[PDB]
Amino acid sequence: QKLSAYVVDWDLPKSIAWDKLDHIVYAFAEPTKDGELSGFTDSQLKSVVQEAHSRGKSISLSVGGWTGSLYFSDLLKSSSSFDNFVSNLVDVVKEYDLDGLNLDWEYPNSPNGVACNSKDENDTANYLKLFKALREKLGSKTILTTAVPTAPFNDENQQPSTKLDDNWASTVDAFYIMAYDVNGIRDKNAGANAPLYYSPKVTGVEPTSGNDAVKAWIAAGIPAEQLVLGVPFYGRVSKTLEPITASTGLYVPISQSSQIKGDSTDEKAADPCPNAVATYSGQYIWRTIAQEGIARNSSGWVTYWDDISKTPYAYSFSGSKVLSFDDAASLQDKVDYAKKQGLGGVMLWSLEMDDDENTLLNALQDIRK
């Protein structure tokens, strides 16, 4: 699995380009309080598994997700709910003829991610117990992967680990680094959604990137070959308080009152926590970007290139907004990095975002390669 591609149950692609990929990750199954797997469509998963196997392709189920991470911590600390979760997790593999499971807990012991998510000092330790259980019960050929944040899983203090149990690398096959959503309204200045690099010279942005995350995880104990760079097929808009020109760069200050809306896929939504506030994400999928000609200086946009983060961005004087995103160029750069760093491969989120010409997916082909 050098090239993995997430598909979403709520929006399957009408046509999956099998020959341009290796491994399909079907998202999501959300764990319930009782430790059962839910929230996915039975017929669709059967359909997609069948297709993948017809063509000699691998498929995994992704358990969890941004809104599916509520019960992970509770489930694993208790011994009874642990075994039943595992039991259900094995059954689903059995049931659908899955080639593996992709655990996506967002995130172990963290006040970030959804606010009301259960959390515990031992979340990472138990996360490792879960994987070990899974391996014992599934064997060595089941693809066991995890989608991970830009720093190693939290310790008993909610700080990224400086060293992960060495059993992590020996149990789990690949760690999919979710190297995107790095910068947002949580920052003072505009930044890249999925930067390849971070520069300390630049303040008012988050001190991480793709390269930095890799570096962090390698240091924590995970070999590079077991690391997988996640890339987006979407971008994000911020509202700049100050207009971007050619003599300004990407890093201008932004509004923080409220996140403005992106494209038509960007519905106002609130996390599954009582009395939480609905918000926009700012998201703009690649399709919108391509159709509206944003990367071609159309529709009132002017396109630039950030030399620091190796990503394109665009600015509309109308509404004063900046769109940080990824194109063929920034994507092919991420692929160059991955190959030179001896990474296991790359993954993309998510397949239905790409245009009908497979522009973004094609830009990723050197990884297979």
3-state secondary structure 120-151: CCCHHHHHHHHHHHHHHHHCCCCEEEEEECCC
Statement to judge: residues 242 and 274 lie in one domain: yes
Task: Look at residues 151, 163, 87, 90 and name the one whose alpha carbon lies nearest to residue 125.
Answer: 163
Statement to judge: residues 129 and 205 lie in one domain: yes
Structural resolution in Å: 2.6
Q: How is residue 252 written in tokens?
A: 């201008």
The helix/strand/coil state of 169 is helix
- Residue 238 burial (CB < 10 Å; 0-12/13-18/19+)? buried
Angle between helix axes 79-96 and 42-54 (nearest 10 degrees) is 60
Q: Is 5 in contact with 24 (CB distance < 8 Å)?
A: yes
Statement to judge: residues 163 and 116 lie in one domain: yes
Q: Is 227 in contact with 169 (CB distance < 8 Å)?
A: no
Distance of CA 268 to the CA centre of its chain: 20
Number of separate domains in the chain: 2
Q: Is 242 in contact with 249 (CB distance < 8 Å)?
A: no
Statement to judge: residues 310 and 333 lie in one domain: no
Lay out the sheet containing 301-306: strands in order across: 283-285, 234-239, 321-324, 311-316, 301-306
The helix/strand/coil state of 102 is strand
Statement to judge: residues 212 and 279 lie in one domain: no
Q: Is 222 in contact with 168 (CB distance < 8 Å)?
A: yes
Statement to judge: residues 16 and 139 lie in one domain: yes
Cα angle, residue 351 at apex, residues 177 and 58 outer, rounded to 5°: 75
Statement to judge: residues 159 and 297 lie in one domain: no
Task: Look at residues 97, 102, 88 and name the one whose alpha carbon lies nearest to residue 52.
Answer: 97
Statement to judge: residues 219 and 345 lie in one domain: yes
Q: Is 195 in contact with 183 (CB distance < 8 Å)?
A: yes
Statement to judge: residues 221 and 259 lie in one domain: no
Strands (E), the chain: 3-8, 23-31, 37-38, 58-64, 100-104, 143-148, 174-177, 227-232, 234-239, 283-285, 301-306, 311-316, 321-324, 345-349
Statement to judge: residues 260 and 356 lie in one domain: no
User: Which residues have a Cβ under 8 Å from the Cβ of 167 and sit 6 or more positions away?
Assistant: 128, 132
The domain of 294 spans: 233-325
Statement to judge: residues 118 and 175 lie in one domain: yes
- Residue 143 burial (CB < 10 Å; 0-12/13-18/19+)? buried
Q: Is 339 in contact with 300 (CB distance < 8 Å)?
A: no
Statement to judge: residues 68 and 156 lie in one domain: yes
